[PDB]
Structures are given as structure tokens and as C-alpha cells.
Amino acid sequence: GSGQMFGNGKGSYFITSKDNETGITGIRVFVGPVGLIKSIQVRYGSSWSEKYGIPGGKAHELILHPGEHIISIYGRYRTFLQHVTLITNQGRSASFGLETGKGFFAAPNLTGQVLEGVYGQFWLYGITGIGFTWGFPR
């Protein structure tokens, strides 16, 4: 779900996670003409989630094969989330957005765990902060 906080800050906030049913089967990233990530959407089973971020841009998708999972995430950011490349347990990678800014690497604490959720902050043109929740599949 999406929501806001009290305080002098700016962003709105979201959290999405494995409902109870099937884990992540796909990922939708919306990128604008300037190359920043505006919003994301995650598919659980066959059901795509709520849109999380700022409306606009063009949809880009990584559709996961059955038994295929996200196991690590490399990215870049400035004020806004610029770039994300998702890497799978099957050796595939999918790059979204423009490669600019500080680099980061996201991976679970426990080997074997996979991506089953995402949380973050969004504000003006897109996502300004992003985090990842991990867990064991099957």
C-alpha cells in the first residue's frame, strides 16, 4: 500500500510484498524521457500490484520464467532513482533507466533467498528512495 507521513519532509511512501500466494513472477518499471525511474509495479502470480510512484513514462518489463527469481539488484541514483539492473538465479539480467550517479548493490543476507517485496519513497518526478525485502522461495 501507498501512504504519507506527518513532518516537514516531502516524499510519499509505499510497501509491497508477497501477499500470501505466489512470489514475484514479473517486474514493471516506468521510465521517463530524462531516464529516471518514475514508478514500479510487481506481479505476484498473475496479478500485477498497485502502481508505486509518479504517473507517466513508458512501461518496461522483465517477465520471469517459472522457477526464475530475482537474487540481486545493482542500481544508481542522484536525487531520484536513475537505474536498476535486476539479476536472476538463471543468469539473466534486465536493465532499466539511465546509468548515472552513486552506485549501490542489493542482495539478501541469506544465500538462497530471493526478492519477494519492495518498499520506498517517491516525490516529484519519480522514486527517490528504494529498499528490498528478501525471502526463501518454494
Data resolution in angstroms: 2.4
Quickly list H helices, 13-75.
none
- What is the grid cell recorded at 122? 517517491
**Given 3-state DSSP classes, what are the helix, strand and coil percentages for the chain, each rounded to the nearest 5?**
0, 60, 40
Distances (CA, A) of 98 to 77, 79, 83: 9, 13, 5
In the PDB record, what is the listed experimental method?
Answer: X-ray
Amino acid type, 52: Y
Q: Which CATH class is domain 1-138?
A: mainly beta
Residue (of 27, 21, 103) closest to 70 by Cα position:
27
- How many residues are recorded in the chain? 138
Answer yes or no: are the C-beta atoms of 96 and 26 closer than 8 Å.
Answer: no
Kindly list the domain boundaries of the chain, sorted by start residue: 1-138
Q: Which long-range contacts (CB under 8 A, 24 or more apart) does 74-78 make?
A: 74/103, 74/104, 74/105, 74/106, 75/103, 75/104, 75/105, 75/106, 75/130, 76/100, 76/101, 76/102, 76/103, 76/104, 77/101, 77/102, 77/104, 78/102
3-state secondary structure of 133: strand
CA angle 56, 30, 115 (to 5 degrees): 145
